[PDB]
Every structure is written in structure tokens, then in C-alpha cells.
Design a protein around this nucleic acid. Structure first.
Ligand SMILES: Cc1cn([C@H]2C[C@H](O)[C@@H](COP(=O)(O)OP(=O)(O)OP(=O)(O)O)O2)c(=O)[nH]c1=O
Ligand code: SF4
Ligand SMILES: [Zn+2]
Lengths: 66, 249, 763, 251
DNA sequence: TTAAGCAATTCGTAATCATGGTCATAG
DNA sequence: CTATGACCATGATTACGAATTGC
């Protein structure tokens, strides 16, 4: 923790995985894996050792009335 | 077609003066089980729940489940054109949006009014039944004076239910004070306790809740952990009237 | 400070020549601009100071650079110990400093600004130019860019990310830094500033700091050296007021026979010109005596003074006024040959400025707190004004009469201190125009020169409500059929109200004056009130704005906007309204009826926290009384009952801590009877179900069509079709109108799942 | 440690109801003789002397010559929260600058315990003269209030003529002149005008309305006057002590 | 040391004044 | 157990300041 919260914030702004501020984080991870762009096997291995926490399993701007 | 007839119009006038300040619009759910109502206040803080059971109306007739939309100010103005001894009948169609009220004096004078209803798009809410753990049954006059007397000091009040009795405290810029009450027919204060309670509620809502004091002699206060305080009144072989208010955090 | 972005041009060339952007992390290249990157902020501030020394600009502009940008840079350079930053000026050994200043007048109000010292260079913040010249509703860059052209915590994670995010941030910053240049060259700011400095004789820094006194002092001194006079110093605290202008009593109502308007042009400067009034020719009460020559040596005014004829002296204020009048005449002669509309109004702005200068020459005399007051002159001016307008009204109503061979004796319906609205009688606009031109040219031959009356318009029909409140339709020629409406004073040009009310007043006067159909007007006002009560009106139409003036007058009595401003937020005690700006608010519903200052809230706070709206406040306090002003004079008091009955057929249709403890009782779609089970239809209203499904799928169909037109408009206003939209612009109707249709669709989609599915889905 | 009781305690409600419209503050002098209050008015025309002996109380403990100050109308607003049959108890610590009021019930089931904070006082204090009052009148309080209120709807200031046979309450007004005459009546409803030498004086009738605020405060009202001196109206607080309102006369 | 004028209409808040519903106690 | 006016409570009228626009 506090290092796992920057890896996800770095996965969320890389443009080669998609334009993602409307959906979940694991849905975008599996969308890129289907098309197989290059999802890395570390943004998966922190979404498995946690429960349904809203500060891991949510996009950066999931507040913010946009 | 709906038609009811009730001999004690005074009960109707007391219930309509319970609510004309807290609520401006309501929907009456007319059924074959009685006349039942739920509403929120205008401030979106408190809940009212009113039940007039079907038996206590001394001449009942309801064909089909209705829903009437009533502006409570115009109805409260109409029900003060009827003295305290009259006999009140309600007449409604199942195709119309206009209600008829006929007041029958117990002596040569009969009166009849027609009032236009309105269509409203409100949503109906309710309550679930759980066991509140502090159960107070107290005189209504003492509760009215206690709320009205603490009101001049400050605006919150803390209710403190302990073993032998309950204790109400309130503060403000001109100081603070409490009132005790202890276990010792209707002038008694019966106190059932399993877990002790201490909670805080604002006074403007309580001074709204104590407007319906002529409906009964005693009042029932129910408390539990972190739930909305319930204020309950009973109307004799007619039904009941409940207000609901949430605690401060 | 993480990014600085700069645009530079030579004046006269239609594009810039320099385009630079300096960032603080490594970035990605932008076509058309240079990009440099640094790993520390000291290098960034040093690089900007060296660039600003080497390019060596004449003028520095921007938007809110005085009160935000330059003192932020100066304080940030002081904190990080960089010694060589604050030397931005032209003199090689001088450092710059922050210094407070205030300005106040009854014309622009009071404003408090900081200044930063730059010797040699000139500053033009475009915000201060807008706030001084223009009277608008919001003064944000988005609002004035829409009005003239047509358009913090997210940025901190666009900068802590990657370098294409930083490239997006730099393109945004460069568009921001480019908009005030376009506004400066499009609005003809600098050309008018240079012409003002050449006509008045004051420097170019005084037209951004001072008022209208230094210019008239300057012109009077420049005219005083040519005859050898010296100015005295009189100072007095304080004299009394004098009597201002007359207004003629109306004949109120609705007119449908044409009224012609005749007025005097440049009234007070020509009074001061053609009766030889000046400081330097004011005759004291004794110095006429014991000489007895009254005839053609002096004159007498209605207030009582005596003033010397022009065969002895020429005053100084006639000559200054004559120069200003010729400059404005040349500006109008240039304006009479344009075809573009925005260019036509900016030349109108130039001539408006020269007429304001000529009238402030007269207003200099009566200012008892000033530098040289002579209230005798002011009283003589307004006495001559009153005498001449009552002369006009007597003459116009007296000559053209039934006994004098004409058709009908005319009757004046109105006059306000420079104009006369005479009602002639004919209903043909050609004959009214012909007689009105004859009347203007006839009456003008009873005066000295340059006193002239002129025809200006014909109103057909006309609507007179009170003093300083009327409306009409505008005729310039006859075969030029009609131009527009005129709304003098009414609820459509003031800024103290809601957009909903001003729009309703404009649409009612449109349907009532152009098409002459009161039934569509009643149906329109009914639909507005019905859609108000049914809770389908956007909150853009509900926002009220008020100006936060000096704090002691707002200490004297409790207001709504003062209460909202002085109540800080928990989020930000560092961004709040200051003195002089405008506070926006809406009124929410509560039970504290003694105080409308206890129900006011910020629009963004009621956005994010979802508080309800007081529809009865907006119904009886905002809407109702302007409508009763407008709709009554065409009919009787059965018209008040007609609109209050239009309301009455439509008032009976209203849409609706403890809120979490819901039960969510289902209800019959046909007859609204709460009941156990989830089926949509009631057992008595079960047959009629195909019609009840038919009804409401044409509502889902129309919500679907509104979702798509809005959420793809943001993609075209943003620029890109492949990346996310981030624009929470509070001055755009687009924002928060795109937020409620998601919830309407969320609700209307779930109401139709009460009905089963129209088929399987797992086959 | 001050701790005092009063069973028939409606009198405290009754005195502070007739105290708060006159003056905004009071200098409470607690001595071993009991509870006392000398205080001027706010308009520099009048004065209140309240004396409450210890023998008019029930149960008493005074260990200090306390000299405190009360803001009156907030104390009256607190005194409005207790009935008239209810027992009034006061408690005070000589270091803790507060007043602890204890309202007992006659049925003892409702207990009240209120607290008002203290504020400092440097109030002026002058002594009354003792002299001969040429007219002392014993009157019913209700009839006296009725008469002066009946005069309030004529004019503003009253002229009095005090003599042997009758007493003459005269006044002018915007509707003209009027006067009512009284005489002795040959225990509470009895009157007596004890007189040596007849006089005439001017007084303010509005201050008589202010003084008749203590109408239910005694058996009888006493009116004591002489030449060019403060009228003292007396309400004998039954078995307790007495309240005397001084009014400096007019010129 | 610094600042162009007057006329008029509209709306909100606190204070002033009118009037009825309870009530409290003397008959 | 029942008249009478004194007492509390709620609504109609006036006054004045603030804001903004027309000449
Ligand atoms: C607008 C305005 C008018 N006035 C006075 C002077 C003017 O002589 C008189 C008439 O007002 P305006 O008609 O507004 O101005 P104008 O008549 O001088 O010029 P034009 O007809 O070409 O528009 O009102 C002022 O003193 N100060 C002002 O700001
Ligand atoms: S909300 Fe959409 S349309 Fe409105 S300003 Fe923002 S991007 Fe443009
Ligand atoms: Zn049904």
C-alpha cells in the first residue's frame, strides 16, 4: 500500500489500453486482454488480493460529475 | 363509489389540525380496510403515518381502492365551518376529482361543501417493525410544557433514559437545565428499559409534534440505538397517529 | 508553478510570430511551437526572465494577470531563493514590488487591485478593460468568449502521469494564453486607446488607472495657456443639491396608432455652446453695476444668473466641447459605411465613448467633491433644458390641429428630458413619417444654433407601463419594414432576475406584438408555469446574481448574497467572492418563511448535494408580478383572473437522514393504488394494458433521443472523438443538462421492466 | 455557602415580572438580614428597594455578605419555566460565579435545576431620605391599577391633590380635562387617606403603570407622598418583607 | 492623496397595529 | 358549572435601505 496506489494510477492513464472513465478497472483489464494489446500481470495481482474496496476497484475520477 | 359516515367530527378536526402546518399536500389511500396515510414533511426530515381503521366509521362503504390528492390548507379551512358536535359524512365518486363533505347538526341545519382535488406524483414510503428498547408512556401535557420550556434556552435536547426514570437536558446561552422523571393511572409515567439510551434531537420538530395534544391523554415515546425516535398516539377504537424523527450524529 | 505559456506578435500582422511553452517535466512535441523542459522550478523561472529580457516587449496583456499571475510568480521566486528573478523592467538595476491600490466612483463602483512595477513596459489586463467598459452578467473568460466569439485537482494528476497527458495540458494552456489576443484585436481596444490618448492629451497608462477628471483638467490647461489665465483652487465641503431634469406625465396603456419620436441631439453641450456659458464669463451679481448695458452684452437664465454675450468674450468650455463634438461626428461619418454587425457595434462603442466624454465635461462643473465646482452653471443648464422641452410640447400640440387644416389634433403622450413622443392620429406609417419629419424640421427653427430637433423613429404598436418603462416596434424607413423591438427599462434587460423570467417576458412580447395573438401567449405562459411545477426546468434558468459592494452598507441590512459569500465553505477558505464581483445563487425550499436569506445556496453545491427547489417562491415572487404588469393594460381585471385561472387549471398538476430508511412501495400505473406484489397494472385496470404500455414507450423513445444529441456535442466542443470529456464549465448549459437525462433514462428504463421482457436472450 | 428555600414561591415570579420592564439589571445584596436590592432606574427618575427578611423564609444558610448582579430579563425568562405552586430554592457558592435555581414540585415528581451565569457590576447607589410624608393612603391594589389605567387613556402625566375629605386625581389630554375624586370608606378593601396638610403635586402616570405592575403583590397598596419628594409606593410582601418603589417628583 | 451629475422604480426585512382562541377565575 | 375580559399568538400596513437602469 502507497506503492500499489500509484501502479493503478499509472495503469489508468496509459493511452494504449483505452479511454476509460466510465467503467470499472478490471473490466478494462479484461477488455485489453481479449484484444491482447499487452496487459501487464501486476495490475491483475493487486485486484485479487483485495476485496471490493472502492479505492482499488474504481477509476480515478469515479467521483467528479463528468 | 365511496361514502363514509362518522358521528364524532371532533376527531376529524383534531387530526386535521395535527397536520396543516407540517404538510401542504397529501394523497389519501382509500381502501376497503380503512383510511390510511403516509407522508414526509416539507423539510424532508420527519415521517407521519395515520391510520383510521374501517370499523370505527359507523357507516362505511367503499367499492374500489381509490387515491385522492388533497391540498390540506383548503381542507383545514373547510373543516372549521363545522361545530364540535356535528356528524360528518364523506361522499366521493370513483370517476371524479371532487369530494363532498356533509355536516349534520344534532338538532334544522345541514351543510354541504364540494372541494376540487388535485393529481400529484408523489412516492409513498414506510417503516419496518423492530423492537425499540426504551419504552416511555407519559402524560402529554407534561411533555408539551417540557419541550416548550426548554425551547427558550437552546435548540437541541438530549434524552437520557436510565433505570428508574428518564431525564431531559438542554443548554443554551442563558444556561442549562434538566428534568427528571421516575417510576412510581394515566398521570403515571411507565418506563420499560432494557438498554439505557442517550440521544440528541432538535426542538422545532418536537414543538411541531406536540400540536396534536387534544387527541389523547398519554403519549408513547420509543427509543433504541441510532434509530429515529418514534412518537405515538392512539385514537379510541379508530386507529393511531405516529411521527418519526432521526437523531443527530 | 508547473507551466508557463507565451504568445507574441508584431502589431499589424494578421498572425503571431512567436509561440513558446515552458514545462517542468519532460513533454511531447507540439507542431507550431517550441517546447523546453527542466527538472527544477528555479531553471523555469530563470528561463522565463531571460526570455522576457531578450524579446523585450512593448505591451504585456493577459486575463487576470495583475491579481493572480505576477504576484504568484514574485512570491514563488522569493520563497525558493532565486535572486535574479524580479528584475523584469527596462532599467538594469531595479527590482519589482507588489503594491495595493483602490479606485472608487459612482459610475463603476469600487475596486481594489494590486499593481506590480515595470518601468518602460505597459500593462493591459483585459479583465479590467471589460469591467470598466461593459455591463454584463458574468465576467468569466468562458462567458465573455461565448458572448463575443462562441464557445484544479484534475490538473495535478495530468501532471503526475505521463508525457502525453502533459502535452494535453500544454495545448490547453496555450489556447488559454491565445484567447485574450483575439479579444484585444477583435474588439478594437488598442486603436481606441491610442485615439483617446491623442484626443485628450493624457498618457497611455492613465486610461487604465484614473477617471474622467484628469482628462478635462488636461484639456482646460491646454486651452488656458493660449490667452494667459491661471486656475484657482476652490474646495468646499459641502454644498447642496440642485434640481435635475423634468419628466412629463404619461397617458399610460396600449397604443395601436403610430407615435413619432422627436428629440434633441447633444443637448447639454449645445446649451453650453450657444448661450456662451463658462467659468471665465460668469458675471458676479455686482460687477454689472453700475454699468447699465443689458441688451446684447449679457443674458439672464431661469435660475437667475447673468452671463456676458459673445461680443465681449469667448469661453473656454465652448471650444473644448466643439473639438469633442467634431471628433464624434467624424467617428459617426466613418460608422455610416460598415456592413458587418459586430464591427458596426464597436464603432458605435467608439462614438458612445466620445459622447460620454463630452457629457462628463458638463458633469465636471457640478461635482462638489472634485477640483473646481461652479453649481451656478449646472443650474443654468438644467433650467434651459426644462424650458426648452415644455416649449417643444406646447408647440407640437398647439400647431397641428383640426381647425388649422390638418386632419386630427395631435396629443403628446410622453416626454423624458430630451425626447417627445407625439401621437399623430393616422394609422399609415408613411403619413406619420412625413408629418413627423415636417414637425421636427419646423420646431427646430426657434433656437440658436447648433440647437436642432430631429425625427428618430415611429413606434407601431406602443406599450407604456410607467415612467422609464415602455416597449414598442421600430421603424427606420417604410420599405425597410421593421427593425426590432424596443424594451426600455423592462424585465428583459435588467440583471437582478432569473433567465426564465426575462425569456418569458421577451417571448410574451414577441407573441403579443408581432403576431398579435393573446391565446398563444396565454398557452405559452401556461406551459412555462406547468413545466415549472412538474419539475422539468433546468437550473440554468433559476440562477440569480447580485453584486457584492462595499461591506458596511451590506452590514446595515441583511441580504441573501452577502450571507452566501460570508459563509465560507469547508472545502476552500481561499476562494470566495471579494468586493466588487458578482455572487450567483439559487433559492432552495425550507420552512423559515421570515427570511429568504436563509434559503440561498451556491449552484455547484446544490448540484453535488442535490437540494430541492422552492417552486412556490419562484411562482409567486419571481414570475407573477412582472406578468401582471404586462398583461393587464390590454384587458381589464378579468385578465388578472384569466392568468390566475390559467394558473388554476395548471396549478393542480404538481410533481413530488430519514430518507435512507425507504420502503419503496410499488404503485399501479393506471390509477395510483399502492398494493402488494410487483406487477405494474391494477386488477380493476388490468384489461386496458396494451394502451398503458403504448403510453410511456413514446416517452422512453424521446428520452433516448435527448441523451444522444447532448453527449456527442461535448465531443465536438472538446475537439477529440477518441478521449474522455472533462469540462465542468458552470457557465455552459451543456453541463448539468447532460447530468439529469442519465437519471431520467435510469428511472424510465426501470419502469418498463415492470412489464416482462419481449423475448428470451440466452438462445 | 448560600442555600435558601421558599415554599409559597410564586412571589419571586411576581416580583421579577414587575421588575424586568422597569430596569435591565439588579444589584442583589445578600446579607444575614436576608435578600435585599437597592437599585436606580434607567431613566434617572425612580428606584427599587426590595427587602426580604430571613424570618419570611423557611430554611436558611448564609455564610457571606454576597454582593452580586443579575441581568433581570433572562432570569425572568428562566423563572417563566416553573409554576406558582412550585417550591423555589436558590444555591450559591462564593467562588463559583453562578446561580443554581432548584424548582421543586408540590407533588415532587418534576424536578428542575437551572443555572444562570454571573456578570460584574459597579452600580451607583444613593440613600433615600427619611422624613414626614404628609399623605399616606392605604388602597386596594386592583382598584388603584384600574383607576390609573382609566386615566392612561386621557393623557400622559397626572396631577394629584391630597387633602382631608377627598383625594383628587386629575389629568388633561387631547380630548380635554378629567378628574376622579376619592374619599375614606367608613382589612384589604378598606381605604384610608391619613393627612396632616393638603398638597398638590405632579407625577408621571406612565410610571404609575410601571409601578402597578406589582398589583397582585400584596394585600393593600400604600401611597406615601409629601412636598417635592419621591413618592414611595409600598407593596407589603406578606409575611416576608416589603417592596418599595421610589419616584423622584417632577417640576 | 483620490473620486463626472440627477430622477425614478422595484423588492425584502424589521417594526407597528389589528384581531381571534384559549383560559382563568369570580358568580 | 358557567360570563367576562386579560393574555398569547398570528397576520396586514408602513418605512427605509439596497440595487439597478434611463436621461
Ligand atoms: C446618457 C447621459 C445623458 N446626460 C444628459 C446630457 C445630455 O445632453 C442629455 C440627453 O441625454 P442623451 O440623449 O442620452 O445624450 P445626447 O442627447 O447628448 O446625445 P445623442 O442624442 O446623440 O444620443 O442627457 C448626462 O448628463 N450624462 C449621461 O450620461
Ligand atoms: S458541458 Fe459540453 S458542451 Fe457544455 S461547455 Fe462543456 S464540453 Fe462544451
Ligand atoms: Zn389500477
Amino acid at each position: 500500500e502507497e506503492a500499489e496506489l500509484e501502479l493503478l494510477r499509472q495503469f489508468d492513464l496509459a493511452w494504449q489500453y483505452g479511454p476509460c472513465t466510465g467503467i470499472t478497472r478490471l473490466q478494462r483489464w479484461c477488455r485489453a486482454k481479449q484484444m491482447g494489446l499487452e496487459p501487464p500481470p501486476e495490475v491483475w495481482q493487486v485486484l485479487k488480493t483485495h476485496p471490493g474496496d472502492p479505492r482499488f476497484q474504481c477509476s480515478l475520477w469515479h467521483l467528479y460529475p463528468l | 363509489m365511496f361514502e363514509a359516515r362518522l358521528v364524532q367530527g371532533s376527531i376529524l378536526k383534531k387530526v386535521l389540525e395535527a397536520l396543516k402546518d407540517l404538510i401542504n399536500e397529501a394523497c389519501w389511500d382509500i381502501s376497503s380496510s380503512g383510511v390510511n396515510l403516509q407522508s414526509m414533511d416539507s423539510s424532508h426530515v420527519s415521517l407521519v403515518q395515520l391510520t383510521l381503521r374501517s370499523e370505527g366509521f359507523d357507516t362505511y362503504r367503499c367499492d374500489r381502492n381509490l387515491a385522492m390528492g388533497v391540498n390540506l390548507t383548503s381542507m383545514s379551512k373547510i373543516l372549521k365551518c363545522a361545530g364540535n358536535e356535528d356528524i360528518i359524512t364523506l361522499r366521493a365518486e370513483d370517476n371524479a376529482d371532487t369530494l363532498a363533505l356533509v355536516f349534520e347538526a344534532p338538532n334544522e341545519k345541514v351543510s354541504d361543501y364540494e372541494m376540487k382535488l388535485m393529481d400529484l406524483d408523489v412516492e409513498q414510503l414506510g417503516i419496518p417493525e423492530q423492537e425499540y428498547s426504551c419504552v416511555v408512556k407519559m402524560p402529554s401535557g407534561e411533555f408539551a410544557r417540557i419541550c416548550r420550556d426548554l425551547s427558550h434556552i437552546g435548540d437541541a435536547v438530549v434524552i437520557s433514559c436510565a433505570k428508574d426514570g428518564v431525564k431531559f437536558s438542554a443548554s443554551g446561552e442563558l444556561g442549562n437545565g434538566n428534568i427528571k422523571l421516575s417510576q412510581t393511572e394515566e398521570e403515571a409515567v411507565t418506563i420499560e428499559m432494557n438498554e439505557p439510551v442517550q440521544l440528541t434531537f432538535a426542538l422545532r420538530y418536537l414543538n411541531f409534534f406536540t400540536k396534536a395534544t387534544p387527541l389523547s391523554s398519554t403519549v408513547t415515546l420509543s427509543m433504541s440505538a441510532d434509530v429515529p425516535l418514534v412518537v405515538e398516539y392512539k385514537i379510541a377504537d379508530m386507529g393511531h397517529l405516529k411521527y418519526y424523527l432521526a437523531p443527530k450524529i | 508553478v508547473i507551466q508557463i505559456c507565451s504568445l507574441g506578435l508584431r502589431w499589424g500582422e494578421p498572425e503571431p510570430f512567436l509561440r513558446l511553452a515552458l514545462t517542468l517535466r519532460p513533454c511531447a512535441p507540439i507542431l507550431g511551437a517550441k517546447v523546453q523542459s527542466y527538472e527544477k522550478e528555479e531553471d523555469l523561472l530563470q528561463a522565463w526572465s531571460t526570455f522576457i529580457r531578450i524579446m523585450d516587449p512593448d505591451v504585456i496583456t493577459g486575463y487576470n494577470i495583475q491579481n493572480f499571475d505576477l504576484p504568484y510568480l514574485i512570491s514563488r521566486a522569493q520563497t525558493l531563493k532565486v535572486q535574479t528573478f524580479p528584475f523584469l523592467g527596462r532599467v538594469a538595476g531595479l527590482c519589482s514590488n507588489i503594491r495595493d491600490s483602490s479606485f472608487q466612483s459612482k459610475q463603476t463602483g469600487r475596486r481594489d487591485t494590486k499593481v506590480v512595477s515595470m518601468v518602460g513596459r505597459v500593462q493591459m489586463d483585459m479583465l479590467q478593460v471589460l469591467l470598466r467598459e461593459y455591463k454584463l452578467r458574468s465576467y468569466t473568460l468562458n462567458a465573455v468568449s461565448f458572448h463575443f466569439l462562441g464557445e484544479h485537482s484534475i490538473i495535478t494528476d495530468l501532471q503526475n502521469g505521463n508525457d502525453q497527458t502533459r502535452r494535453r495540458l500544454a495545448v490547453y494552456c496555450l489556447k488559454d494564453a491565445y484567447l485574450p489576443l483575439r479579444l484585444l484585436e477583435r474588439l478594437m481596444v488598442l486603436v481606441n486607446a491610442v485615439e483617446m490618448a491623442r484626443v485628450t492629451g493624457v498618457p497611455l497608462s492613465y486610461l487604465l488607472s484614473r477617471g474622467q477628471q484628469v482628462k478635462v483638467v488636461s484639456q482646460l490647461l491646454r486651452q488656458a495657456m493660449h490667452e494667459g489665465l491661471l486656475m484657482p483652487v476652490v474646495k468646499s465641503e459641502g454644498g447642496e443639491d440642485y434640481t435635475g431634469a423634468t419628466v412629463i406625465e404619461p397617458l399610460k396603456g396600449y397604443y395601436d396608432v403610430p407615435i413619432a419620436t422627436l428629440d434633441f441631439s447633444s443637448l447639454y453641450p449645445s446649451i453650453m455652446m450657444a448661450h456662451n456659458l463658462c467659468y471665465t464669463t460668469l458675471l458676479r451679481p455686482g460687477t454689472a453695476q453700475k454699468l447699465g448695458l443689458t441688451e446684447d452684452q449679457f443674458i439672464r437664465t431661469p435660475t437667475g444668473d447673468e452671463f456676458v454675450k459673445t461680443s465681449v468674450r469667448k469661453g473656454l468650455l465652448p471650444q473644448i466641447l466643439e473639438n469633442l463634438l467634431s471628433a464624434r461626428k467624424r467617428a459617426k461619418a466613418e460608422l455610416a459605411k460598415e456592413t458587418d454587425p459586430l464591427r458596426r457595434q464597436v464603432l458605435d462603442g467608439r462614438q458612445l465613448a466620445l459622447k460620454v466624454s463630452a457629457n462628463s465635461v458638463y458633469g465636471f462643473t457640478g461635482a462638489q467633491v472634485g477640483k473646481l465646482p461652479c453649481l451656478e452653471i449646472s443650474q443654468s443648464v438644467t433650467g434651459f433644458g426644462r424650458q426648452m422641452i415644455e416649449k417643444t410640447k406646447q408647440l407640437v400640440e398647439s400647431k397641428y390641429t383640426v381647425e388649422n387644416g390638418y386632419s386630427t389634433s395631435a396629443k403628446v403622450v410622453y416626454g423624458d428630458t430630451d425626447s417627445v413622443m407625439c401621437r399623430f392620429g393616422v394609422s399609415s406609417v408613411a403619413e406619420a413619417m412625413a408629418l413627423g419629419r415636417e414637425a421636427a424640421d419646423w420646431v427646430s427653427g426657434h433656437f440658436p444654433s447648433p440647437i436642432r430637433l430631429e425625427f428618430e423613429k415611429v413606434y407601431f404598436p406602443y406599450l407604456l407601463i410607467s415612467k422609464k418603462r415602455y416597449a414598442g416596434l421600430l421603424f427606420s424607413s417604410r420599405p425597410d419594414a421593421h427593425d426590432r423591438m424596443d424594451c426600455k427599462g423592462l424585465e428583459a434587460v435588467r440583471r437582478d432576475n432569473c433567465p426564465l423570467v426575462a425569456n418569458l417576458v421577451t417571448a410574451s412580447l414577441r407573441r403579443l406584438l408581432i403576431d398579435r395573438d393573446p391565446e398563444g401567449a396565454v398557452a405559452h405562459a401556461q406551459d412555462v408555469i406547468s413545466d415549472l411545477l412538474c419539475n422539468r426546468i433546468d437550473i440554468s434558468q433559476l440562477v440569480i446574481t447580485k453584486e457584492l459592494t462595499r461591506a458596511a452598507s451590506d452590514y446595515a441590512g441583511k441580504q441573501a448574497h452577502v450571507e452566501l459569500a460570508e459563509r465560507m465553505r469547508k472545502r476552500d477558505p481561499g476562494s470566495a467572492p471579494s468586493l466588487g464581483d458578482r455572487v450567483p445563487y439559487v433559492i432552495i425550499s425550507a420552512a423559515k418563511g421570515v427570511a429568504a436569506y436563509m434559503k440561498s445556496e451556491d449552484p455547484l453545491f446544490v448540484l453535488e448535494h442535490s437540494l430541492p427547489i422552492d417552486t412556490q417562491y419562484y411562482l409567486e415572487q419571481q414570475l407573477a408580478k412582472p406578468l401582471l404588469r404586462i398583461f393587464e393594460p390590454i384587458l381589464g381585471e378579468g385578465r388578472a383572473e384569466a392568468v390566475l385561472l390559467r394558473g388554476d387549471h395548471t396549478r393542480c398538476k404538481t410533481v413530488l437522514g430519514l430518507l435512507a430508511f425507504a420502503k419503496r412501495r410499488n404503485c399501479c400505473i393506471g390509477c395510483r393504488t399502492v398494493l402488494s406484489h410487483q406487477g405494474a397494472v391494477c386488477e380493476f385496470c388490468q384489461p386496458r394494458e396494451s394502451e398503458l404500455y403504448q403510453k410511456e414507450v413514446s416517452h422512453l423513445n424521446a428520452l433516448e433521443e435527448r441523451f444522444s444529441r447532448l453527449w456527442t456535442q461535448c465531443q465536438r466542443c472538446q475537439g477529440s472523438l477518441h478521449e474522455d470529456v472533462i469540462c465542468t464549465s458552470r457557465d455552459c448549459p451543456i453541463f448539468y443538462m447532460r447530468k439529469k437525462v442519465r437519471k431520467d433514462l435510469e428511472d424510465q428504463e426501470q419502469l418498463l421492466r415492470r412489464f416482462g421482457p419481449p423475448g428470451p436472450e440466452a438462445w
